[PDB]
Amino acid sequence: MTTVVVHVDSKAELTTLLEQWEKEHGSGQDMVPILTRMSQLIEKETEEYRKGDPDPFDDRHPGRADPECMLGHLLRILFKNDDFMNALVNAYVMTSREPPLNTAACRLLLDIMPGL
Amino acid sequence: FGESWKKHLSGEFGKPYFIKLMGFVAEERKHYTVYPPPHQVFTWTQMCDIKDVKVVILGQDPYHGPNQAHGLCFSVQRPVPPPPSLENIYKELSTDIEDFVHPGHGDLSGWAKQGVLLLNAVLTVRAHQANSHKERGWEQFTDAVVSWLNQNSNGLVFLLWGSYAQKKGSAIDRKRHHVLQTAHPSPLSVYRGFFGCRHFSKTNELLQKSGKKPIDWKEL
Amino acid sequence: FGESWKKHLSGEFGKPYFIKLMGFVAEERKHYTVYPPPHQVFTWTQMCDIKDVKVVILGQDPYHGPNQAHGLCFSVQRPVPPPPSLENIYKELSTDIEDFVHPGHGDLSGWAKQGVLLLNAVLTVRAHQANSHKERGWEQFTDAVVSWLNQNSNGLVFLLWGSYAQKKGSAIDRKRHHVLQTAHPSPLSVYRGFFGCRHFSKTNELLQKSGKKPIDWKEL
Amino acid sequence: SALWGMKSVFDMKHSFTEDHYVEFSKHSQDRVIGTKGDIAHIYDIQTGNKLLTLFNPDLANNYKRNCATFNPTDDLVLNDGVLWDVRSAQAIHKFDKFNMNISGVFHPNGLEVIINTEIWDLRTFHLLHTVPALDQCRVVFNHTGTVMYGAMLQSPFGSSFRTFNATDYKPIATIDVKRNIFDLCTDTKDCYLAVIENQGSMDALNMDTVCRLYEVGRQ
Amino acid sequence: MEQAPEDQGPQREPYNEWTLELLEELKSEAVRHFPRIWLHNLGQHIYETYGDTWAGVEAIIRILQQLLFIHFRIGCRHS
What we know:
The structure is cut from a larger assembly and holds 2 copies of chain A, 2 copies of chain B (220 residues) and 1 copy of chain E (79 residues). Chain B contains 5 helices and 2 strands, in the order ααβαβαα.
């Protein structure tokens, strides 16, 4: 219980992301310099995941498997999208032609590559 | 939310289970999807008033599919094809109302302005899941509402059909009110009794024992 | 019979089941032996008043043997050797009252002047037979008494132990009163809960939440 | 039972409200026979009327599952284990009942009658043979009529197969199908077995009954 | 070269009504062969788990027709 980090709170670094796009109900901005963090936070989260020398036969999630590190603490959040982030699968594919308009799309499906 | 409803419902907060309700279900909104949003829980306390409540009809479980329900019991959205038990109570309405008109949809925005308390017992359940939650506080919050109406408002009726509604509001007196119960409106209810009973007159007819604001079923 | 009890119990007669009760049970007195006579039915409405009622304890079935019971629930005549469940509630009384005195008999003429409503649900059954009768009218005559006390008198408590007492008086509010239930006082009640619970303080203790006329258990 | 149509238009071309098991006529397929209880009705396809209903109250065996069939010469009917000459509506020979369920079938040679485990003759009416591995199994022959298939109807149903010969009734194989066999049909061109098998345990509350195609003659 | 025939058979367009024309009929034969103890209890067991959502309405016509087939197949004359 209350397993907190000794570094800066990465979940608060994710929750502060969660109050931007969920408040982007057509606010009229382009999230392409903010959704780099959706590739940058998790690769920072991947950079520390190699510490425990993992077994590479893990097609499941560490939210199911390893509650000891910050990967499984954070994968359960943005996989449990409440059919709201799942619209962005529908939105930024059906209505995507421009290269910034795919930049918020094609970086991010591999950001849910175990979740895919 | 309707303020005049809470003229004396300020004795709904200060109990050990209320903060268990509006925080954890909000926490269930912060992780999962409980299906009805906060702007559909408060429809029954907004559309009708508390000054004209005359029929008390309970509701067991909400509708776990997305874009189906809107808060009232036995009720569903208008573009949804209509639910079968609500399609099943229509069958007795033809056999008793000679002027039977047809709703054609599933939104119950027509009978809600009559004097029917279309209340779900547990107002929120999860998406795609029927009865996942424990007693997180939706029950006794309504138990403190149903038996509270035995004091202040008057002219109710109890068509507490099904054993889930029998446990909640049975022992309310029969001098001031009238309690008539039968089998469930669902056709999944093998022990019969609902299948032809003419209870639906006794919204129009048991108010002749009171003399209050009238009812027409045909507002559809 | 006590007249001040029927200050407002005149709404006990004019129902379709009352003449079903006082005639047919009298007809059962004109053929058979229902055990408690008419001069022992009216003891609870004579010995205590209605102005001081503070504990509500129900009673399921009377005592079918001759020369045993005298009307009050869980009660028996003084020369009768004492009944085992009344001998079983004595066990917790020692563990909570440090000054535990012993009754030595089975007449409950000591606690009846305290504020306990020792009411049998069905007041009369036959001699040498436990549950022969149908619902001849003893139930709803008391159901119109128990929930009537939710209006006028005040300061009650519900130790509705056993599922027979749970159905009758559960839904009475917890703001005005206090309802605490557990397993049956009989030792024939395999699912435990009664066997050490310290409910018997909460006649002396839950009245500190009210502040009314006090209680001593030791009037024996 | 309903005679549907499968040319290009799908319709109940004749309807029956009565019979629990209908069956064609073998060589000239213009007749459809069907049986309710112990009463078997002969129907036409062209007009669907009752052609001749055959039953003798003095003679029936009262099997549990009566299924009147035809011989391949379209002249004899096994109703209640009684033969019936269809030229003049008469009974020929009652058989002796032994097994309470199965009313019999014709062997494709036109020489025998196969009641449940008793092998009879058509012209001498003598018990030739008795195969105890035919204990309450529904039988399916090859189109050439050279092998007999066996599926147990025993509660489980069909813990294996049962492969028989059509000449000497020697058992060829009992291949172990671990699930429960419910139905069995085979090709006209001897290549597949249509096998309705039930998944899970013996659960009357949950039945996952799939179809599994086998190949004839491959290891 | 097999041409599967045109499905001009009996269609069932009011599926909310054809179910209601037959869900009583599924109850109108199971009571004629079985006591009502299992009938209400299995109907309650699905209603606690599928509710009034049509996912028990067709599913009871699954379970009733799955049993009434096999109960007329195992070898009980009624049950």
